Structures are given as structure tokens and as C-alpha cells.
Paper text:
This pathway includes an iron-dependent extradiol dioxygenase, HsaC, that cleaves catechols. As in the aerobic bacterial degradation of other steroids, the core 4-ringed structure is degraded via opening of ring B with concomitant aromatization of ring A. The resulting phenolic metabolite is hydroxylated, yielding a catechol, 3,4-dihydroxy-9,10-seco-nandrost-1,3,5(10)-triene-9,17-dione (DHSA). The overall fold of HsaC is that of a two-domain type I extradiol dioxygenase, with the structure most closely resembling that of BphC (rmsd of 1.16 Å for the 275 common Cα atoms). The active site is located within the central cavity of the slightly larger C-terminal domain, with the catalytically essential mononuclear Fe2+ ligated by His145, His215 and Glu266.
First, the loop-helix-loop segment comprising residues 172–190 in HsaC, which contributes to the external wall of the substrate-binding pocket, angles outwards and contains a 6-residue insertion with respect to BphC, increasing the opening of the substrate-binding pocket by up to 10 Å.
Numbering used by the authors:
A (entry chain A), B (entry chain B): 2 to 297
Write the structure that this text describes.
């Protein structure tokens, strides 16, 4: 523990657009009990996976990371204490809002905020998408998120050495792409695992207005993906990449712009990894085929 | 009885375009022993599946239909004689050229030419696509071909009642689509099977320049399809339909224009049918998702 991506909390300038998009494009289900004009989007037994709160910005607020139990959370505390990373225990009100038994809050060096928790409540009535797809979560958690970092070496240190994620994959970026002179060194996009899902987390050393590069959610079948593409097309959702399969996690997916300005990857067939045999290597292409990121 | 589609012979106005497309887009392999300036494209142990001969038009010449043995071919002779359909035995030169033991030649009432044969020679050196895909033939044969017909009822009688194909699916057209009065009767696109492949043959009662609406070839995996689409886009092959999944045969495929001006559907995951269970019904949509023919 940490074992998986639990939830994502984001701020939004357009709550109506997010509601229509989560319901009619993503085919998520609305959760009950929210604020004060906030939106809970459900994919499974979790009370909420995507929480959208109204605000003046379109940005990531926090990612919530689930541990197996009190001991698995304490292990994260002990790592943080060894590094000297400041953290706070959740207030009574934060525990009640998130519906978790314990949680700590802290930030990585680039100052992306984390909530690490255990003992979430679940809701048990069947979550049924009107479009007939089922999301793939379980032991792989919510999906995976790719976030901006200020410094890839620093991110590698905090996520692997401090937090204990595994390095799953790495891809180099030419120095020009990251605002470095043509004469100096490439920078690194690194993918991190906490469970069999190839990656739950990755860091792009390039800035974004939201802090999010992409959020991937996974469904069981290619037909689920293709039907989703059709719904997005009908609703004039702006496209970011055509259908394709990734090299590193073998995900078959397309990418589309959300109302928050970052991409959602809507995929299937994500590769599962066993840490006992996985060899961390450098991948040299994004995709095996498709995924034309010029489409936007 | 006829067991599968064996080969397709077409005439072409641009042999160089076909050789490049066959090799670099379809990833078929060139056969040997082709006559003067003809092109043999191979998918498997057949000496050729797609035969392209020089000519003044881009047009279907004949479809070759494989039977299991001499008795299977005689059963077709018997059916033709019962109907009063004229047919000719292949000459010595024709048997040698097609590399078959026996073959009869005749046409349907719309004038489409059939060559029904048994005892093909095979070639045994491995056929290796440079792109790494394997075609799906075997008991399913070469693929399927959708052809023009002048009269759907007469085609239904000839293919089902006379030749013994099974009716596999039907799709209705608005009377006005076939230039009838808008309060006239619908016409019918009918799909015919001779093996587990959902259909080997279908008839659109609408005219085409070549006689061909589409030729489908099948590969093992979605990645093979996705890779082919990238090759085709790179080579500026005209797209006819986006990636999608058909309703009737569940083929996951895209459509593209060949050098002959007709479409090839390049697909995977074709549905298998058992005649003991199969119910012949009317489908009311082309696709579950995708297959936007508006791109062409
Ligand atoms: Fe992803
Ligand atoms: Fe087809």
C-alpha cells in the first residue's frame, strides 16, 4: 500500500458541461450526497471516482490513493517521515466528506497534492451505465493519471524511492520539446505502478493549465470504446488522438478533450504486470498503430 | 456443394498501382508463374487468391468457388441441369492456368461469371507477410465478396434455390434508393453462406462500375487491421469507411478504395455460423459502431 488510484478531485468552471459529459459521453453514473453544486461520477462500488467541484479554475485539486488497511497507510507515513515530507492528518470533516477511515494529505516536490487513505465506504446497489459498458477497476483501481512535473529526476525520487511505486516504463523527450536548447540532454516521461495495471501514474516534465495530461478510464471490450467514440463524435467532443494501441501498456483507446481542458483516454485491454518478472525498459514510440495526436 | 470462395479474378487498367497496393498496403505476397504482365496475390497455400490481369476496364472477371471433391462438383452440375442453366467444362488450357482438376463455367441471371472447381494445386513454402499478419482462410475460404445484382429475387432463387447457398442475413433498401416510386416496394441486400464464415457472398441490387461493392479479407488480430490502416493512410489510399464493427458478421474492419475503384474491407473477428442453429433474419443497421461511410 499504496495499492491503487482511488479517486480524483478536480475544480471546474462549467458544472453543466461536466455533468452532460460524464453522463452522456463517459456513461458514468451520478452519485448522491454531494455539496453545494458539486458532481460525483461513479464507475463502480466507490461512492465516487471522479469528483468535480465548482470553482474559478479548471484544475486537479487532489488525487486519492487507496491502501489495503491501517498498516499500509502507516507504512506510507513512515516513508514520508524518513524523507521529511510534511503531511497532515485529515480533519473529522475531510474524513466524512471522502468517506474514509483514515487519510493523510501532502504534496509532491512539484506540489501536486496527494490524499492517501484506507477503509473507504462502498455503495452496493448496482451501478449500471445506460450504454451497457462496465468499467475495469477492482485491484487495478480507478484507472491511471498522467500529470505534469517540474523535474523528472525529482519526481522519480519521490514516487519510487520515497513512496515505493515501481518504475514500469520510461520514454525520452527531445530537449526542444521541453524548452531546453537543442544541444542539451533529453528529458524523461516515466510511468509508475502500484498494482498489476501497467501504470497508475505518470509524470510529463511539461506544463499543463490543469496539471493533468490525461486521465484514462478502462472498459471491458473494444465495442465499449467504439460506442463511446460514436457518442463523443455525435456530441462534437473535440478529439485529441484517433483509435490506437499503446506500446507500453497495450491499451486500445482514443483520446478526447474533457470540459476541463485535459484529455480523457477511454480504453480497453490494458496489460497487467507482475513485478517479480517485469523489466523496466525504455519505450521509443507512443503507439504500435493509430493514436494520431495531430487530430486536434 | 460449393464449400468456399477460392479466388477472385479481376481486370485492371493500372497493374503498377495494384502490385504496389497488394504488396505494401494489403501485405499479400506475389505468386509465381503468372502469364504476361498478370499479378498473382497470395494469402496462404493457394497459388493465388487475387488474380489481377491487364485490361481496358476495372471489373470483376469471375469468382472461383471451391468444392470438396469431384462428387461435390457433380452435385452443382446436377443443380444447374435441373434449372436449365448453361455451363461449360473448362478447356485443358483453363484447367492448367487455374491449376484445378475440374472446373465448370457459367453465369448467374445478372451475368456475373462463376468458375466452380475442385482439386486445386497448393504451394507449400511458407507465405510470410512482411507486416507480420496472417490471413484467416482455411475452411472459411478467401473472404467474402459483395457484388451488384439486377434483381434481388432472381439472385435469391439462383444462389439459394439452385446453387444451395444458405440465406444468412437480409437488409432492406428504400424503394427510392433503387429508383422506384417512394411508395413502391423495398429492395433487398442479401447475404449468403456456404461455410462457417457468416457470408462468402452478398448481392446489392444497385449498380457498380466494376461489378464489385466490396471485397473483404480477414486477418487474425485487431492490431493487424490497425497496422494496415496506418500503411494505407501513409500511402494516401482513399478511405471509404472509418473503423467499426458490423452488425451481421461482427467484423471489426475499415474500408478503403482499391486501384480498381471498389472497396476492400480489411477485417478481423468475423462471426462463425452453424447452419443447425442459424436463424435467417433482417438486420436494420450496417454497424454497431463506427464504419462512417461519409468519409468516402
Ligand atoms: Fe494512458
Ligand atoms: Fe464485408
Amino acid at each position: 500500500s499504496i495499492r491503487s488510484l482511488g479517486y480524483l478531485r478536480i475544480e471546474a468552471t462549467d458544472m453543466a458541461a461536466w455533468r452532460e459529459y460524464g453522463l452522456k459521453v463517459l456513461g458514468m453514473v451520478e452519485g448522491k450526497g454531494a455539496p453545494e453544486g458539486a458532481l460525483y461520477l461513479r464507475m463502480d462500488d466507490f461512492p465516487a471516482r471522479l469528483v468535480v467541484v465548482p470553482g474559478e479554475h479548471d484544475r486537479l485539486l487532489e488525487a486519492g490513493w487507496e491502501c489495503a488497511n491501517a498498516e499500509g497507510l502507516q507504512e506510507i507515513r513512515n516513508r514520508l517521515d524518513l524523507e521529511g515530507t510534511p503531511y497532515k492528518e485529515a480533519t473529522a470533516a475531510e474524513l466524512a466528506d471522502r468517506r474514509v477511515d483514515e487519510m493523510i494529505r501532502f504534496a509532491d516536490p512539484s506540489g501536486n497534492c496527494l490524499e492517501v487513505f484506507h477503509g473507504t465506504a462502498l455503495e452496493h446497489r448496482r451501478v449500471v451505465s445506460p450504454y451497457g459498458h462496465r468499467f475495469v477497476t477492482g485491484e487495478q483501481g480507478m484507472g491511471h493519471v498522467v500529470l505534469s512535473t517540474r523535474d523528472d529526476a525529482e519526481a522519480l525520487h519521490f514516487y519510487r524511492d520515497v513512496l515505493g511505486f515501481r518504475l514500469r516504463d520510461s520514454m525520452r523527450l527531445p530537449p526542444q520539446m521541453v524548452g531546453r536548447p537543442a544541444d542539451g540532454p533529453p528529458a524523461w516521461l516515466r510511468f509508475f505502478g502500484c498494482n498489476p495495471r501497467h501504470h497508475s501514474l505518470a509524470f510529463l516534465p511539461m506544463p499543463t493549465s490543469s496539471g493533468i495530461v490525461h486521465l484514462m478510464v478502462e472498459v471491458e471490450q473494444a465495442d465499449d470504446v467504439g460506442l463511446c467514440l460514436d457518442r463523443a463524435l455525435r456530441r462534437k467532443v473535440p478529439m485529441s488522438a484517433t483509435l490506437g494501441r499503446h506500446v507500453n501498456d497495450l491499451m486500445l483507446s482514443f483520446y478526447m478533450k474533457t470540459p476541463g481542458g485535459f484529455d480523457i483516454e477511454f480504453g480497453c485491454e490494458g496489460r497487467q504486470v507482475d513485478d517479480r518478472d517485469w523489466i523496466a525498459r525504455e519505450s521509443t514510440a507512443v503507439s504500435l498503430w493509430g493514436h494520431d495526436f495531430t487530430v486536434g
